[PDB]
Scaffold this active site. Structure first.
Site, PDB file in Angstrom:
ATOM      1  N   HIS A  10       0.866  -1.177   0.000  1.00 44.21           N
ATOM      2  CA  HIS A  10       0.000   0.000   0.000  1.00 44.21           C
ATOM      3  C   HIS A  10       0.894   1.215   0.000  1.00 44.21           C
ATOM      4  O   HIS A  10       2.126   1.115  -0.013  1.00 44.21           O
ATOM      5  CB  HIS A  10      -1.124  -0.012   1.067  1.00 44.21           C
ATOM      6  CG  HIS A  10      -0.702   0.115   2.462  1.00 44.21           C
ATOM      7  ND1 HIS A  10      -0.281  -0.946   3.233  1.00 44.21           N
ATOM      8  CD2 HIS A  10      -0.690   1.187   3.318  1.00 44.21           C
ATOM      9  CE1 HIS A  10      -0.021  -0.525   4.472  1.00 44.21           C
ATOM     10  NE2 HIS A  10      -0.252   0.764   4.545  1.00 44.21           N
TER      11      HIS A  10
ATOM     12  N   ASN B 149      -3.161   2.090  13.019  1.00 48.21           N
ATOM     13  CA  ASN B 149      -3.350   3.417  12.489  1.00 48.21           C
ATOM     14  C   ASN B 149      -4.431   3.349  11.419  1.00 48.21           C
ATOM     15  O   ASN B 149      -4.226   2.805  10.330  1.00 48.21           O
ATOM     16  CB  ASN B 149      -2.073   3.975  11.925  1.00 48.21           C
ATOM     17  CG  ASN B 149      -2.167   5.412  11.643  1.00 48.21           C
ATOM     18  OD1 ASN B 149      -3.249   5.947  11.377  1.00 48.21           O
ATOM     19  ND2 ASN B 149      -0.995   6.116  11.669  1.00 48.21           N
TER      20      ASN B 149
HETATM   21  C1  YRF Z   1       3.105   5.032   8.306  1.00 49.59           C
HETATM   22  C2  YRF Z   1       1.814   4.493   8.836  1.00 49.59           C
HETATM   23  C3  YRF Z   1       1.906   4.291  10.382  1.00 49.59           C
HETATM   24  C4  YRF Z   1       2.514   5.149  11.269  1.00 49.59           C
HETATM   25  C5  YRF Z   1       2.527   4.906  12.669  1.00 49.59           C
HETATM   26  C6  YRF Z   1       1.974   3.756  13.198  1.00 49.59           C
HETATM   27  C7  YRF Z   1       1.341   2.852  12.358  1.00 49.59           C
HETATM   28  C8  YRF Z   1       0.625   1.666  12.560  1.00 49.59           C
HETATM   29  C9  YRF Z   1       0.358   0.909  13.825  1.00 49.59           C
HETATM   30  C10 YRF Z   1       0.050   1.536  14.982  1.00 49.59           C
HETATM   31  C11 YRF Z   1      -0.223   0.660  16.109  1.00 49.59           C
HETATM   32  C12 YRF Z   1      -0.111  -0.744  15.909  1.00 49.59           C
HETATM   33  N1  YRF Z   1      -0.425  -1.616  17.015  1.00 49.59           N
HETATM   34  S1  YRF Z   1      -2.079  -1.980  17.354  1.00 49.59           S
HETATM   35  C13 YRF Z   1      -2.722  -3.011  16.040  1.00 49.59           C
HETATM   36  O1  YRF Z   1      -2.781  -0.667  17.491  1.00 49.59           O
HETATM   37  O2  YRF Z   1      -2.255  -2.732  18.518  1.00 49.59           O
HETATM   38  C14 YRF Z   1       0.190  -1.340  14.708  1.00 49.59           C
HETATM   39  F1  YRF Z   1       0.285  -2.710  14.481  1.00 49.59           F
HETATM   40  C15 YRF Z   1       0.501  -0.485  13.719  1.00 49.59           C
HETATM   41  C16 YRF Z   1       0.207   1.270  11.299  1.00 49.59           C
HETATM   42  C17 YRF Z   1      -0.702   0.169  10.885  1.00 49.59           C
HETATM   43  O3  YRF Z   1      -1.688  -0.071  11.577  1.00 49.59           O
HETATM   44  O4  YRF Z   1      -0.551  -0.364   9.742  1.00 49.59           O
HETATM   45  N2  YRF Z   1       0.664   2.107  10.361  1.00 49.59           N
HETATM   46  C18 YRF Z   1       1.323   3.132  10.959  1.00 49.59           C
HETATM   47  N3  YRF Z   1       0.673   5.380   8.548  1.00 49.59           N
HETATM   48  C19 YRF Z   1       0.613   6.815   8.382  1.00 49.59           C
HETATM   49  C20 YRF Z   1      -0.778   7.069   8.317  1.00 49.59           C
HETATM   50  C21 YRF Z   1      -1.614   8.296   8.179  1.00 49.59           C
HETATM   51  N4  YRF Z   1      -0.831   9.453   8.147  1.00 49.59           N
HETATM   52  C22 YRF Z   1      -1.703  10.669   7.946  1.00 49.59           C
HETATM   53  C23 YRF Z   1      -1.337  10.657   6.529  1.00 49.59           C
HETATM   54  N5  YRF Z   1      -2.470  10.303   5.697  1.00 49.59           N
HETATM   55  C24 YRF Z   1      -0.449   9.469   6.724  1.00 49.59           C
HETATM   56  O5  YRF Z   1      -1.505   5.936   8.372  1.00 49.59           O
HETATM   57  C25 YRF Z   1      -0.649   4.832   8.579  1.00 49.59           C
HETATM   58  O6  YRF Z   1      -0.986   3.724   8.622  1.00 49.59           O
HETATM   59 ZN    ZN Z   2       1.178  -0.421   8.520  1.00 51.97          ZN
HETATM   60 ZN    ZN Z   3      -0.608   1.789   6.364  1.00 56.69          ZN
END
Ligand code: YRF
Ligand code: ZN
Ligand code: ZN
Length: 232
Positions: A85, A181
């Site tokens: 993605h 996220n």
């Molecule tokens: C770069 C990425 C991003 C960054 C930081 C953390 C995560 C997390 C994440 C968190 C907690 C847990 N642990 S848990 C299930 O909670 O227990 C986990 F497994 C993953 C995931 C995911 O879940 O994949 N991904 C992240 N980003 C950026 C983003 C949106 N920003 C606004 C703009 N549009 C981009 O969105 C996203 O995914």
């Molecule tokens: Zn991720």
């Molecule tokens: Zn993501």
């Protein structure tokens, strides 16, 4: 020393590999985002005397470290990469790959989203994946578009030789108490997309989430449960 490598065990900048099955590894790196540190996974699949990479190591310097770790531990060239993605944990490092001779690929949906967001952009478009339930072959893997989940463009990857299902960020680890996220997610469609994965890959033996520990098929139902409860 053999256990799956975890967030507090990997300094940001370092990469570790974990053997999943014959000719299949995950890669694990850590990165800071909004003042917190997170692990993330990718995949490496042996493709004869070459390697197919799935996802960057979340950043340019992490991705350079990934390439070095692959050379140390495996010693076969990475020739192609697929990003599953558009987020930085999937494409950040594509420019490093592209300058190391790796041909980079993603769906047109991912490429558009990456461009619009200011993320690094894979070079080549993967057609044939635009409708949920679509599947295409790519070297030693099958790429599958389950529908919107963690993001609208998320792809999953199956290694048929090993029955390994790499869910990417559409699949969460069993310890997850939240849905990660969700900024770009479709919480309403996510369970439906997970059900598509379950239907399509009923013989999966290992399921690898985008972040955290691999397990078995239960990761899929757990993911649906945490997302439904997050929505609720
Ligand atoms: C770069 C990425 C991003 C960054 C930081 C953390 C995560 C997390 C994440 C968190 C907690 C847990 N642990 S848990 C299930 O909670 O227990 C986990 F497994 C993953 C995931 C995911 O879940 O994949 N991904 C992240 N980003 C950026 C983003 C949106 N920003 C606004 C703009 N549009 C981009 O969105 C996203 O995914
Ligand atoms: Zn991720
Ligand atoms: Zn993501």
């Amino acid at each position: 020393s053999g256990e799956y490598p975890t967030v507090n065990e990997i300094p940001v900048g370092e990469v570790r590999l974990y053997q999943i099955a014959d000719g299949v590894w995950s890669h694990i790196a850590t990165q800071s985002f909004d003042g917190a540190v997170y692990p993330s996974n990718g995949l490496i699949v042996r493709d004869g005397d070459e390697l197919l990479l799935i996802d960057t190591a979340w950043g340019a310097k992490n991705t350079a470290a990934l390439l070095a770790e692959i050379e140390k531990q495996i010693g076969l060239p990475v020739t192609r990469a697929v990003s599953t993605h558009f987020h930085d944990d999937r494409v950040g490092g594509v420019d490093v790959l592209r300058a190391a001779g790796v041909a980079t690929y993603a769906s047109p949906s991912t490429r558009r989203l990456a461009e619009a967001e200011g993320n690094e952009i894979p070079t080549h478009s993967l057609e044939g994946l635009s409708s949920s339930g679509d599947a295409v072959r790519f070297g030693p893997v099958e790429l599958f578009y389950p529908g919107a989940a963690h993001s609208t463009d998320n792809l999953v990857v199956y290694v048929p030789s090993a029955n390994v299902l790499y869910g990417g960020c559409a699949v969460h680890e069993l310890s997850s108490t939240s849905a990660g996220n969700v900024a770009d997610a479709d919480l309403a469609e996510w369970p439906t997309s997970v059900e598509r994965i379950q239907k399509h890959y009923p013989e999966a033996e290992v399921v690898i989430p985008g972040h955290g520990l691999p397990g078995g098929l239960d990761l899929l139902q757990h993911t649906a449960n945490v997302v439904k409860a997050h929505k609720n």
